[PDB]
Amino acid sequence: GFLAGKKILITGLLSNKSIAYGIAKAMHREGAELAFTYVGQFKDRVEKLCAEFNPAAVLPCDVISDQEIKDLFVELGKVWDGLDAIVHSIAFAPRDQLEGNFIDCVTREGFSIAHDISAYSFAALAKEGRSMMKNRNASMVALTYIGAEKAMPSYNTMGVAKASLEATVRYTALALGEDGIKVNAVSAGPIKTLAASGISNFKKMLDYNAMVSPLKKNVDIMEVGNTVAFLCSDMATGITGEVVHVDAGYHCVSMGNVL
Amino acid sequence: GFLAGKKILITGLLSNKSIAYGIAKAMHREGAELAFTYVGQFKDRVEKLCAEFNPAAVLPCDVISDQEIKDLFVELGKVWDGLDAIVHSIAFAPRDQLEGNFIDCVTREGFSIAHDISAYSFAALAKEGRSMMKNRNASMVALTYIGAEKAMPSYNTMGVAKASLEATVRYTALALGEDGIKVNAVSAGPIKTLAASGISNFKKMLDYNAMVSPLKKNVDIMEVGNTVAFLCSDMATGITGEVVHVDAGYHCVSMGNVL
Numbered sequence: 205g206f207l208a209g210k211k212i213l214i215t216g217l218l219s220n221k222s223i224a225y226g227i228a229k230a231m232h233r234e235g236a237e238l239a240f241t242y243v244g245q246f247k248d249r250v251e252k253l254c255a256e257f258n259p260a261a262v263l264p265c266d267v268i269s270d271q272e273i274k275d276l277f278v279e280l281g282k283v284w285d286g287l288d289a290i291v292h293s294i295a296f297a298p299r300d301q302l303e304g305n306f307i308d309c310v311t312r313e314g315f316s317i318a319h320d321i322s323a324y325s326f327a328a329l330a331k332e333g334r335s336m337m338k339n340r341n342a343s344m345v346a347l348t349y350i351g352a353e354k355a356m357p358s359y360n361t362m363g364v365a366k367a368s369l370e371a372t373v374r375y376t377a378l379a380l381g382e383d384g385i386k387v388n389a390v391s392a393g394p395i396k397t398l399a400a401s402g403i404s405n406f407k408k409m410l411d412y413n414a415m416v417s418p419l420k421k422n423v424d425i426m427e428v429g430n431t432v433a434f435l436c437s438d439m440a441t442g443i444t445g446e447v448v449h450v451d452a453g454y455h456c457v458s459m460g461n462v463l
Numbered sequence: 464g465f466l467a468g469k470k471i472l473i474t475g476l477l478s479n480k481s482i483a484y485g486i487a488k489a490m491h492r493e494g495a496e497l498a499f500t501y502v503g504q505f506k507d508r509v510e511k512l513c514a515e516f517n518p519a520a521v522l523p524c525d526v527i528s529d530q531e532i533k534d535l536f537v538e539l540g541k542v543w544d545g546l547d548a549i550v551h552s553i554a555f556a557p558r559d560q561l562e563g564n565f566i567d568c569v570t571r572e573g574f575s576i577a578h579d580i581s582a583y584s585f586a587a588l589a590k591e592g593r594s595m596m597k598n599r600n601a602s603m604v605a606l607t608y609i610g611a612e613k614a615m616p617s618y619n620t621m622g623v624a625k626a627s628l629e630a631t632v633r634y635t636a637l638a639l640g641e642d643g644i645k646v647n648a649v650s651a652g653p654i655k656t657l658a659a660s661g662i663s664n665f666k667k668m669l670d671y672n673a674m675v676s677p678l679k680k681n682v683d684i685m686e687v688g689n690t691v692a693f694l695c696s697d698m699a700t701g702i703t704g705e706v707v708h709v710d711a712g713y714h715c716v717s718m719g720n721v722l
């Protein structure tokens with residue numbers, strides 16, 4: 205496999221629908237040795253789910269906490285002498301941030317929390333993981349969404365947080381490139397995961413995507429996972445600071461024939 | 464290999480330094496069955512170059528000619544029942560279009576030629592290859608350069624032609640997506656190929672790229688080749704109308720610390 209022997213930390217695996225589950229399957233297929241994180245309450249659920257990937261460790265990490273991120277790498281360092289990649293598949297904004305008019309709904313605390321968990325946490329993992337990732341053609345990949353680039357209904361504070369995340373990815377690529385670490389993002393089309401479950405007309409966003417995209421379909425977690433896997437391989441060593449859309453071509457069209 | 468059994472046409476192989484050479488190496492490694500084109504006088508040279516890939520066909524195609532493009536697919540259709548991918552790795556502008564001030568140097572005929580061979584030829588291959596590529600998760604990849612996006616010294620008419628090529632890729636992605644054909648471009652950093660030989664200061668452009676890029680290196684044909692290979696695989700079926708930079712991160716930075 206094209207990731208044979210590479211040691212990769214995957215955050216954000218919550219259910220078998222999670223994007224991180226597709227990432228895990230693809231990476232396990234390609235021979236990677238995997239470790240996983242979970243937010244406190246979900247310990248049992250995640251442990252059971254990632255057991256199919258023969259994980260080297262399954263460790264708590266709530267990215268609101270500097271201490272938990274520090275302790276993640278301490279514990280990981282007890283099982284691994286070095287780290288090849290970190291996959292960031294984590295996002296959060298308070299429910300009230302999403303849906304409704306952006307200016308009606310946005311709040312100072314909501315904006316702050318969304319940025320903290322969805323964007324800062326990428327830099328946080330880079331800061332604490334860097335010493336393990338030095339000088340081994342290491343990789344980081346974050347998951348993002350086109351709401352970073354364009355104003356969209358409902359996505360609201362999360363769109364702003366994703367724009368912050370994409371800039372964080374570029375500045376991280378610059379910061380870590382001297383150590384041979386490449387740093388990229390995958391901008392996924394919508395996928396019905398647990399993140400979708402708060403969103404009333406989500407299925408309708410899916411329907412629109414399948415209608416308007418060049419490929420006339422919705423993407424799946426394997427299409428996303430396989431791309432994330434490629435971006436942590438030696439094949440991808442000339443790629444950094446890049447956002448690769450895995451969205452059936454949605455990003456490249458405007459209007460379409462069906463108005 | 465991740466291209467096992469896929470039938471792929473590679474244009475633009477001219478020397479063992481060609482980007483198309485790195486593409487061929489990567490695709491051959493991944494189990495692709497390959498065919499190659501050459502322009503008029505270079506038949507023997509290209510035959511010699513691609514022998515190591517056990518090609519299914521090596522056929523003339525000067526993309527100035529609609530007839531030659533049509534007859535390419537007639538001949539390919541005699542060895543293959545369907546076609547999985549077309550790799551476009553072709554560019555030309557008359558010498559006087561490059562170097563010097565863009566407005567001083569640009570001419571009506573130079574502009575037209577550059578666009579005909581460097582951009583229109585992508586649509587021309589799509590038009591004649593479409594019937595062979597229908598409904599088999601087929602792929603097209605074009606090679607492009609950041610001079611499409613930004614004004615750069617010397618690149619001149621070629622930069623304009625690459626912008627045309629990138630729009631052509633997007634419109635082709637839209638036009639072919641209904642047939643399941645994904646259509647993308649790889650934007651490579653500078654590489655010392657035959658295309659570079661006419662350019663006076665080329666080494667200095669390489670030096671600049673290695674200094675300012677986050678990864679502090681120049682890319683090679685294998686880094687480009689492996690990415691083109693990925694974009695012709697079933698792993699990439701969520702990706703279309705995309706431009707992927709393989710340039711050590713050059714595209715994501717501005718200014719740098721060394722002015």
Ligand SMILES: NC(=O)c1ccc[n+]([C@@H]2O[C@H](COP(=O)([O-])OP(=O)(O)OC[C@H]3O[C@@H](n4cnc5c(N)ncnc54)[C@H](O)[C@@H]3O)[C@@H](O)[C@H]2O)c1
Pocket residue numbers: 215216217218219221222223224242243265266267268292293294295296321347348349391392393394395396397398399400
């Ligand atoms: N679902 C989509 O339509 C889609 C599209 C584009 C991008 N994305 C992105 O993909 C990523 C994964 O989302 P998903 O759709 O698989 O949903 P998901 O609900 O399965 O996963 C989101 C993950 O974020 C984690 N998380 C939230 N707060 C956290 C915290 N404080 N500390 C650590 N982890 C925390 C959750 O536990 C969960 O594992 C997110 O960045 C999301 O924005 C999703």
Ligand SMILES: NC(=O)c1ccc[n+]([C@@H]2O[C@H](COP(=O)([O-])OP(=O)(O)OC[C@H]3O[C@@H](n4cnc5c(N)ncnc54)[C@H](O)[C@@H]3O)[C@@H](O)[C@H]2O)c1
Pocket residue numbers: 474475476477478480481482483501502524525526527551552553554555580606607608650651652653654655656657658659
């Ligand atoms: N070398 C670089 O710095 C670099 C960087 C970015 C993009 N590219 C692009 O990569 C592609 C390959 O270029 P390369 O650097 O490997 O150089 P190269 O000289 O090896 O290949 C250019 C190819 O274009 C072909 N060509 C020219 N006119 C043609 C015609 N009329 N019909 C058919 N084929 C024709 C040539 O025969 C040759 O095989 C081009 O699109 C180029 O713009 C090169």
Ligand SMILES: COc1ccc(Cn2cnc3cc4c(cc32)CCCC4)cc1C
Pocket residue numbers: 295296297302303349351356357358359362394399400402403409
């Ligand atoms: C165009 O609107 C949308 C498009 C995609 C989505 C799906 N989605 C993508 N990233 C997300 C992050 C979060 C949620 C939903 C998310 C919810 C919980 C917090 C984090 C949602 C909307 C609303």
Ligand SMILES: COc1ccc(Cn2cnc3cc4c(cc32)CCCC4)cc1C
Pocket residue numbers: 554555556561562608610615616617618621653658659661662668
């Ligand atoms: C910023 O300047 C440059 C940056 C990269 C290059 C290399 N290069 C990339 N695509 C090309 C196409 C052609 C030439 C050179 C090319 C020459 C022959 C015709 C086709 C050249 C310049 C000048």
Ligand code: NA
Pocket residue numbers: 516517
């Ligand atoms: Na062989």
